[PDB]
Design an enzyme around this catalytic site. Structure first.
Site, PDB file in Angstrom:
ATOM      1  N   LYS A   1     -56.364  15.724 -58.182  1.00  0.00           N
ATOM      2  CA  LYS A   1     -55.395  15.447 -59.246  1.00  0.00           C
ATOM      3  C   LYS A   1     -54.225  14.712 -58.635  1.00  0.00           C
ATOM      4  CE  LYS A   1     -52.777  17.308 -63.120  1.00  0.00           C
ATOM      5  NZ  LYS A   1     -52.135  18.534 -63.711  1.00  0.00           N
TER       6      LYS A   1
ATOM      7  N   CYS B   1     -46.751   2.318 -62.284  1.00  0.00           N
ATOM      8  CA  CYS B   1     -47.975   1.983 -62.980  1.00  0.00           C
ATOM      9  C   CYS B   1     -48.500   3.146 -63.786  1.00  0.00           C
ATOM     10  CB  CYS B   1     -49.027   1.530 -61.968  1.00  0.00           C
ATOM     11  SG  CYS B   1     -50.666   1.224 -62.617  1.00  0.00           S
TER      12      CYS B   1
HETATM   13  S1  FES Z   1     -48.871  -0.462 -65.623  1.00  0.00           S
HETATM   14 FE1  FES Z   1     -50.477  -0.616 -64.048  1.00  0.00          FE
HETATM   15  S2  FES Z   1     -50.043  -2.470 -62.918  1.00  0.00           S
HETATM   16 FE2  FES Z   1     -48.450  -2.427 -64.540  1.00  0.00          FE
END
Ligand code: FES
Ligand code: FES
EC number: 2.6.1.3
Lengths: 74, 75
Positions: free
Chosen positions: A22, A39
């Site tokens: 996780k 991200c």
């Molecule tokens: S949200 Fe994954 S590279 Fe931009």
């Protein structure tokens, strides 16, 4: 024309740290610069940071995901 | 003596969240954060952009290993 289904169970993260059951990242806000962009698509080659991979993902799959930005008020 | 584990797919990641928004981006000022903010990276939370534990069921169902992003105050 109609159609039925089943249990596919597609993974979101295809390749990142697969030996980790996780994946969780934790950062102290005091040690961040003026801005950090994280991200949320698991496609970045700089994970956990956003490198713009989201764009190709959305275009290819029709999705609408994007990153999380933590910044100083400025 | 060689074999691969293919996990690649063309599926969307976000199935249901704010689909009228062509690209969901969140931006927060750290000065306005409390001691601990836990952000969803699985797009299954009912409290998106915050983690509500939906990632556990997703991982169980799919064999995935995703989890949240935590921004906190230093201890
Ligand atoms: S949200 Fe994954 S590279 Fe931009
Ligand atoms: S609910 Fe999505 S990462 Fe926890």
């Amino acid at each position: 024309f109609y159609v039925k289904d089943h249990r596919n169970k597609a993974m979101i993260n295809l390749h990142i740290q697969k030996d980790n059951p996780k994946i969780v990242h934790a950062f102290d806000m005091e040690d961040l610069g003026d801005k950090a962009v994280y991200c949320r698509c698991w496609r970045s080659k700089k994970f956990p940071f956003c490198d713009g991979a989201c764009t190709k993902h959305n275009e290819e799959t029709g999705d609408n995901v994007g990153p999380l930005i933590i910044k100083k008020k400025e």
